[PDB]
DNA sequence: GCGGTAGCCG
DNA sequence: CGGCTACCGC
C-alpha cells in the first residue's frame, strides 16, 4: 500500500511537537506541508532526518512554504510556477517513489473586491496550464495542498452564508474545478461522497469543533490511474485535538499500490 | 515544617508551565513570585485554584508585578508602599499562615549614572522607613523578593568587572545593607554563609551555569526569632533547566515550626 | 486565535 | 535569549 498525506502545518518549526509524532505514528509514503513559514536555511530538516524522512522545502521568511517529506529520495525537485511571478514559496514539486507530486499553497484571496482575490483567481488559471502542460495523465501523480477553496456546498458548515467568502465564492470554486476537470480525483469523494469532513476549523471560531463550524479547502487529488487504486481517504482529527494544534487537520490517501 | 519560597518568574502567563509543576511536586506553603507582567484582570488565578493554591497580586500590562499563592488563605492584603509614588506592581503583602509576608520587586535602576539608579536608592530608602515603621522583629515575619541587590562578593561572579553595575554598586549595597541591620536575617547565608549559589543567570549567557557566571540578588530575609527556626535554603536549579525556563532560580527556605 | 515580523530591554 | 509593545495575515 501507498500512503500520501497533506498537512497545512501553521508554521512549521512551531509544529514538530505535532508533525514529528504524527509521523512516527501513520509512517506516510509522502507527506506534504503548507505554510511552513521558513526561509530554507531554517528549515529544521534534522527533525526529519533523524525519524527516517527525506524533506524538501522551498520557502521565504515568515510566510507561505511548503514542503514535502518522504521515505524515499526525492527527484527532479522543482519550485514555484513555470511564469512570473514564481511563487516558489507556493508550490514544490518533485518525483517520489514513482509518484510526480506536486504540492501547492494557493492564495487565500482575502476579500473578493480586493487585488488579492484577482491574485488568487490569476494564480488557478496559472496553474491550470502549468498542470495541463506537465502533468501525465495516464501516469501516477498527485496534486496535494491547501487549496483555499471549498469546490461543493458540503466542502462548507454554512453554503448558504458564504457566497462572498473569498473560499467559496463562484469565481474561484470554477477556477479550481477547471483544474479538476483535466482529470483530478478528488479521493475524498470517491470514499467519503457528500459527508461533512473538514481539515480546518478557525482558531477564532468559540468551540468550533464540536459545533462543525468547519471547512474543507484541502485536497489530494490524483490522475485516474492513480484514484482508480484508491481504497481509503480521511483527515485525522487527533492533532487537531492536541494541545497547540494547527488549525488545519492531516488529509490522508490510502492506494492499492 | 514549613516551606518558603521566591521566583522571579518573568511573566506569569508565560511561566506556567514551570510554576504550577513546581508548585505540584514541592507544595511549598508560600510562593512569592515577581516581574508576572499581568494586569489584575488577567492573572491567572484559576491555574493556582485548581492545584489548591490560594494567590493574591498586584500588577498592570506588561511590566513589573508581583504575586503570592499560599496554602492558607491570606488576610490582611495590602498593596505598594506607603507613600507616592506607591508603586502596587512592586510590593505585595500578606498575613499568612500568622506570617507577616512583604514581597518587593526593587527597581532594577538601569545604569549607575540615570535618574533610574536615583528612583532604585530612594525606594531602598522609602522601604527602610515602611519596614521600620511596620514591622515587629520579635514577630515571625519574612521579607522576600528580586532585590537587584547582590550584598556580598560572593553574590556575584565577578565583583571586580561589576563594580560599576546598579546590582552590585555601592550606593545600592549600602542601601540595601541598611534594611538588614533593621534585623534581616538573609536565610541562604545562615545555611550556606560561604557557598557561591546564584538564583539568576542570563539568558544571553551561553553556558553561564556550568560557567559560574550567575548572579543573587533574590533573597528570603526572615525576622531573628523565625530566622532562628530555618533549617534548610537552597537555590532550585532543576526549573533553570526547563525549555522555556525563567532565567530566575526559585529560592526556598525550610523553618522547623 | 495564533502563527509570523520588527525594535526595545536586561 | 526571551519577555515586552506593536503590527500583519489568514
Known amino acids: 500500500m501507498l500512503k ?6 501553521n508554521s512549521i518549526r512551531s509544529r514538530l511537537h505535532i508533525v514529528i509524532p504524527w509521523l512516527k505514528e501513520n509512517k506516510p509514503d509522502i507527506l506534504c506541508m503548507q505554510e511552513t513559514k521558513v526561509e530554507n536555511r531554517k528549515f529544521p530538516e534534522a527533525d526529519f532526518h533523524r525519524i527516517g524522512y527525506h524533506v524538501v522545502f522551498s520557502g521565504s521568511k515568515g510566510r507561505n512554504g511548503v514542503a514535502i517529506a518522504s521515505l524515499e529520495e ?31 499553497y494557493v492564495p487565500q484571496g482575502f476579500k473578493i473586491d480586493s487585488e488579492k482575490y484577482q491574485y488568487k483567481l490569476q494564480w488557478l488559471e496559472r496553474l491550470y496550464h502549468y498542470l ?18 471549498a469546490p461543493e456546498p458540503i466542502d462548507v458548515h454554512s453554503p448558504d452564508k458564504l457566497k462572498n467568502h473569498v473560499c467559496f465564492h463562484e469565481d474561484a470554486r470554477r477556477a479550481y474545478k477547471k483544474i479538476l476537470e483535466l482529470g483530478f480525483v478528488d479521493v475524498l469523494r470517491k470514499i467519503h461522497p457528500n459527508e461533512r469532513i473538514y481539515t480546518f476549523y478557525d482558531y477564532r471560531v468559540k468551540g468550533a469543533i464540536e459545533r462543525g463550524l468547519g471547512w474543507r479547502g484541502d485536497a489530494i487529488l490524483a490522475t485516474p490511474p492513480l484514484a482508480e487504486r484508491c481504497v481509503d481517504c480521511y483527515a485525522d482529527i487527533k492533532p487537531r485535538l492536541a494541545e497547540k494544534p494547527s488549525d488545519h487537520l492531516p488529509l490522508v490517501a490510502v492506494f492499492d499500490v
Do not use: H, Y
Not at 514559496?89 to 507530486?101: C, E, M, Q
Not at 495523465?137 to 477553496?149: H, I, K, L, Q
Open 4 to 9: 500520501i498525506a497533506t498537512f497545512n502545518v
Open 74 to 104: 526525492p527527484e527532479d525537485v522543482s519550485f514555484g510556477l513555470d511564469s512570473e511571478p514564481k511563487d516558489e514559496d507556493r508550490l514544490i514539486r518533485a518525483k517520489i517513489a514513482g509518484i510526480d507530486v506536486i504540492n501547492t
Open 132 to 149: 495541463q502542460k506537465t502533468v501525465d495523465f495516464r501516469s501516477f501523480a498527485v496534486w496535494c495542498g491547501d487549496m483555499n477553496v
